[PDB]
Write a protein that binds this ligand. Structure first.
Ligand SMILES: O=P(O)(O)C(Nc1ncnc2sc(-c3ccc([C@@H]4CC4(F)F)cc3)cc12)P(=O)(O)O
Ligand SMILES: O=P(O)(O)C(Nc1ncnc2sc(-c3ccc([C@@H]4CC4(F)F)cc3)cc12)P(=O)(O)O
Ligand SMILES: O=P(O)(O)C(Nc1ncnc2sc(-c3ccc([C@@H]4CC4(F)F)cc3)cc12)P(=O)(O)O
Ligand SMILES: O=P(O)(O)C(Nc1ncnc2sc(-c3ccc([C@@H]4CC4(F)F)cc3)cc12)P(=O)(O)O
Ligand SMILES: O=P(O)(O)C(Nc1ncnc2sc(-c3ccc([C@@H]4CC4(F)F)cc3)cc12)P(=O)(O)O
Ligand SMILES: O=P(O)(O)C(Nc1ncnc2sc(-c3ccc([C@@H]4CC4(F)F)cc3)cc12)P(=O)(O)O
Lengths: 339, 339
């Protein structure tokens, strides 16, 4: 996206400084561990699309009078932006261990690299630690300092709670607990808060917008947005052309609590529920195709197509009603970019 | 200890409130995960001696004029005390995963309990999250609020760095990297900071003692103390009568970077180093006894006995020189209790 593609180069260049600062030796004793930290950051914070991190910068630009966007201010925006990317990094290193994943972004998951293993648990925590070190270094003197600390801490809590909810929901194959109230709730805590609310809110705080009604309004928009994109993500998992997407979907084999399956569960006859119990989770693809064919049989696409349309109207309506005092274009810019 | 045994009952009773607060449902959607959180706290924060947590309370009593030790103040001290215990809990859940431990306090490690597994990684992070939730709830309006947030965050960073250092130092059997500079450094980051500096410093902050020279002095004492007790702990591992201690030592089988082995390495002839390479790490006890007998051969006890004596004089000297403006008895009280 133009506004995101504009900001990107300078953002990703800043990562050099991030690492320099975080690894910079009045204490020689810890050199080796600091070396290890460099390895961990380089491997794990680098390679994504950086949509979350960039949203901090784009929003900051949109939210501050340009007279007050000096050298120092953007440094800070880049830093706070990278703080989000470290939070994501923390989450994914650990998620990959917990899920017993192999690949992450088409490359070997860190914990699987020869000689890392469960040491990766410590590594994940180091990534999280780095957030607060960066906040102290670049923002301790700023009025929004405490607000960001609390915002990040809270964002972690909410995600971990959501991860708990997901882990409870999807151990052992049981669809009885794959409700829509429960799906809506996993998505909200585990992805929407830190993926959609956090980056904008850090920018709002950075720009002196600290009021609770302001934040509540931003949140209301951003969470419903987050819900939409996860549902989209779940749709495209099975039906998206993977050359378009990037992912090759495995939510059926993985036994994940997908939007698709929740909907399928509200619609299936007792006969079909049995067919679902029969096929959801297996490696072998003859079973996997029996799930997709069931969904298709239930015209779940049309259900989705319907969901999208309703959702478009709801979202635009919320932005109308709740974006100001912020510019509509922070919301729209992000939507543009995540779609 | 009288001063610790005095404070204990009320402390441990407070844990009921901790849990009530941390699990208390305008959102019914997350009930199940909150339930899980209760299970995690109950299992993991309970059962230790609580020396770290209690040190916050004892020190608070020692450090505040009693006119200013109202109902509310102690609530807060209990809470901050429990924050330390949660930090320890976070560390140990994760350490046990990383070390592939079975038992912790003579009971099954959490991650080994049927149905937890690597979900424990999330659980560990929840324990850490709880620290900042408690700090917000009980101390957001207090002047020391930010100081404690930063103190806890920093304490986590230092420990994780130390854990990195330990993981690098003791993968694969190699004594070449078991130096004394390196031992002294692991102990400092991984145990001394959060076990000795953190609890006193939280109390200092709580009592309005925020100055850097004040804290630097406390730190100087408390780190050297921490070094002493870890070395003691390493000694008693092999030589302590385990009915006295509580632990049955396995630092030789576990291949840990013990004080004992570092010293043994500075003393061994090329002949004996070979005997050490020969026996350090094995399950079988004929090998394990060949290590103990080597240490004995090197009169490592007398070396230790010597270390203790020197260390006593050094510590008392530091307290003389650096305790005031604080009462000597916060240092001494703690020493009394950890020995
Ligand atoms: O296919 P994945 O990408 O692995 C997906 N997971 C997620 N997706 C988008 N955001 C988050 S945030 C998240 C997460 C958060 C916290 C943690 C653990 C607690 C911690 F941070 F240590 C682990 C994973 C997972 C997670 P799935 O597991 O639902 O299949
Ligand atoms: O490929 P597309 O042209 O994008 C088509 N998409 C749609 N088709 C019919 N109605 C809607 S409404 C819609 C939409 C809804 C919400 C949003 C984002 C959340 C928001 F409102 F911010 C963006 C686009 C897409 C959409 P397909 O992807 O289903 O093939
Ligand atoms: O024939 P098409 O136009 O390609 C049709 N698509 C749509 N139909 C009716 N409304 C919308 S709105 C929409 C859309 C809206 C927003 C966006 C991005 C977020 C934004 F507004 F910037 C992308 C696609 C597509 C879309 P289909 O392929 O589903 O048959
Ligand atoms: O015999 P153990 O008790 O397991 C001993 N370990 C420790 N001892 C006293 N304090 C700490 S603090 C600590 C630690 C800190 C951080 C972590 C990981 C980073 C995290 F918190 F996730 C794991 C363990 C271990 C640790 P050992 O592993 O040296 O044998
Ligand atoms: O059983 P014990 O009587 O305690 C005997 N202990 C000692 N023996 C000869 N010198 C010293 S000097 C000493 C000592 C040193 C430092 C400290 C703590 C660190 C401090 F200074 F705060 C406490 C006691 C113990 C100590 P043992 O345990 O070796 O059998
Ligand atoms: O014949 P013992 O007295 O039992 C002799 N022990 C000691 N010898 C010379 N200084 C100290 S100082 C000391 C000691 C000091 C402090 C403490 C706790 C920390 C305190 F000061 F409160 C415990 C023991 C023991 C101790 P041993 O058993 O090593 O032969």
């Amino acid at each position: 996206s133009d506004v995101y593609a504009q900001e990107k180069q300078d953002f990703v260049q800043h990562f050099s400084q991030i690492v320099r600062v975080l690894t910079e030796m009045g204490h020689p004793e810890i050199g080796d561990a600091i070396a290890r930290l460099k390895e961990v950051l380089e491997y794990n914070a680098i390679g994504g699309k950086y949509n979350r991190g960039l949203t901090v910068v784009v929003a900051f630009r949109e939210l501050v009078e340009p007279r007050k966007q000096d050298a120092d201010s953007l440094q800070r925006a880049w830093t706070v932006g990278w703080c989000v990317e470290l939070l994501q990094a923390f989450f994914l290193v650990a998620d990959d261990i917990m899920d017993s994943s192999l690949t992450r972004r088409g490359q070997i998951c860190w914990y699987q690299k020869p000689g890392v293993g469960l040491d990766a648990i410590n590594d994940a925590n180091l990534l999280e630690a780095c957030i607060y070190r960066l906040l102290k270094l670049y923002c301790r003197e700023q009025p929004y300092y405490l607000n960001l600390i609390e915002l990040f801490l809270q964002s972690s809590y909410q995600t971990e709670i959501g991860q708990t909810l997901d882990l409870l929901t999807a151990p052992n194959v049981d669809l009885v607990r794959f409700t829509e109230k429960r799906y809506k709730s996993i998505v909200k805590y585990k992805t929407a808060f830190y993926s959609f609310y956090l980056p904008i809110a850090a920018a709002m705080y950075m720009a002196g917008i600290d009021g609770e009604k302001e934040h509540a309004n931003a949140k209301k928009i951003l969470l419903e947005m987050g819900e939409f994109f996860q549902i989209q993500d779940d749709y495209l998992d099975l039906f998206g052309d993977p050359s378009v997407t990037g992912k090759i979907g495995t939510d059926i084999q993985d036994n994940k609590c997908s939007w698709l399956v929740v909907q399928c569960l509200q619609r299936a006859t007792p006969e079909q529920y049995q067919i679902l119990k029969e096929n959801y989770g297996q490696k072998e693809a003859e079973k996997v195709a029996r799930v997709k064919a069931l969904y298709e049989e239930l015209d779940l696409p049309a259900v989705f197509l319907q969901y999208e349309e309703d959702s478009y109207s709801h979202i635009m309506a919320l932005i109308e009603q709740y974006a100001a005092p912020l510019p509509p274009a922070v919301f729209l810019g992000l939507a543009r970019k995540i779609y």
